[PDB]
Amino acid sequence: EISTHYVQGSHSEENEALLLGEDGNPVQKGDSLKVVPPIYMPHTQAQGATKIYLSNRGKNIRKPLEGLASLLKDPRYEFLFNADDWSVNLDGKTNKDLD
Amino acid sequence: EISTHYVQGSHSEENEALLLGEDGNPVQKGDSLKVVPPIYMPHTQAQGATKIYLSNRGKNIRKPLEGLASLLKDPRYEFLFNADDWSVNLDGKTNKDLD
Amino acid sequence: SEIDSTILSQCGTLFALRMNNSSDRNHVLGAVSDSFEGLMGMLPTLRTGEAIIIGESVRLPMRTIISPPPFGRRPDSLDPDVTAKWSNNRVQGDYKEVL
Numbered sequence: 001e002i003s004t005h006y007v008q009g010s011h012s013e014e015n016e017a018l019l020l021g022e023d024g025n026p027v028q029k030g031d032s033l034k035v036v037p038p039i040y041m042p043h044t045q046a047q048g049a050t051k052i053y054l055s056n057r058g059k060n061i062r063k064p065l066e067g068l069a070s071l072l073k074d075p076r077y078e079f080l081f082n083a084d085d086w087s088v089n090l091d092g093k094t095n096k097d098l099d
Numbered sequence: 100e101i102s103t104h105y106v107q108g109s110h111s112e113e114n115e116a117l118l119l120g121e122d123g124n125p126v127q128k129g130d131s132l133k134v135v136p137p138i139y140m141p142h143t144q145a146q147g148a149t150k151i152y153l154s155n156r157g158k159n160i161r162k163p164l165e166g167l168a169s170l171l172k173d174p175r176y177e178f179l180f181n182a183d184d185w186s187v188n189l190d191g192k193t194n195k196d197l198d
Numbered sequence: 199s200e201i202d203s204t205i206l207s208q209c210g211t212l213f214a215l216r217m218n219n220s221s222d223r224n225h226v227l228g229a230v231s232d233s234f235e236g237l238m239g240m241l242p243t244l245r246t247g248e249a250i251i252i253g254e255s256v257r258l259p260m261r262t263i264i265s266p267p268p269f270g271r272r273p274d275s276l277d278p279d280v281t282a283k284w285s286n287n288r289v290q291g292d293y294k295e296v297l
Contacts, residue, residue, distance in 0.1 A: 009146040056145060099297040 001058030001065070003040040008053035017041045017052045032090060035073050100157030100164070102139045107152035116140040116151050131189055134168050199225045211253030216244040234259055 006017035018026040019041045030038025045051035071077055085095040105116040117125040118138045129137030144150035171180055184195040199221045206229040217223050223241050227233065232252055237259050241250070247266070252259045 010148070011145075057143075097297065099293045 001055060001062055003038060004043050004052050004054050005056070006050075006052060008045055008051050011053075011056045035069050037069075100154065100161055102137055103142050103151050103153045105140075105149070105151070107144060107150050110154040110156050134172050136168075201225075203229060209253070211251065211255045214241060214250045214252065215248070216246070217241045232259055237261065 004017045005011045006015040017040060018029065019039050021027045026039070028036070028039035030036060041052055043052060043054040045053055072081055086098075088094055103116045104110045105114040115137070116139060117128070118140050119125050125138065127135065127138035129135060140151055142151050142153045144152055170176055185193055187193055199219075203225070206225070209229075212226070212230060214226055217226065226241075227238055230238075230252055237250060237252075240261070244250070244261075247264055249262050249264055250259065251262055
């Protein structure tokens, strides 16, 4: 919903236009376990420079997603989102089960 | 209400833009006696790929249909939806009648 | 006292067993058309099994003793016996099957 595609028309995930640093590496590639979101180049496809177009697939749920992120970073909801042994990894595997 | 026509403007059932596999067969054709829904190609009419437009005949009853689908698979409604000798098959034929 | 008054008033015959609270007795008295003060004053002091048949199916309101059913034919809901189940020694469980 926020990241921009490097090529207009299509919004393929392999054409992510992340703002790269001076050394070459991206400034903020983003993290999944951490709730920090990645940084993206500004949406401006004018003449002179390369044409970068915004995401063409996002819905209108930016506000609920921000609320969910705020809840995820809240230490008062650990009993739901950061359970002791029933934490879910990125691939969907927990230490224990419901039994 | 979900499956999209392969061509915009017309919503013919024979133009179902389903998601096909590498071999050529669709990923999920869908079943009637089973409650699995068919898989469809994502709605996208941008450049590069074909123009995919969702069907315009769909009503606003997605939630009641989802509820009915959930009820159909509930084993607590066998007496209603899955009577032993009064189960209606696809073409509307019953083994026995109300007599 | 919860049954609709109009529905109860049209019942042909009443079988008034022992009744404890006063609201139900008042409702029954208000939903009967053949009232004898002596008979209706004995409601809260009826033995286990007695009845007071009132209505158009008898010659007179009359205090009867309903004939007991033959032995071995007695209504009984097979609800769990809490004391018997809880008195048993505990055994190692297996909740994988339950899950």
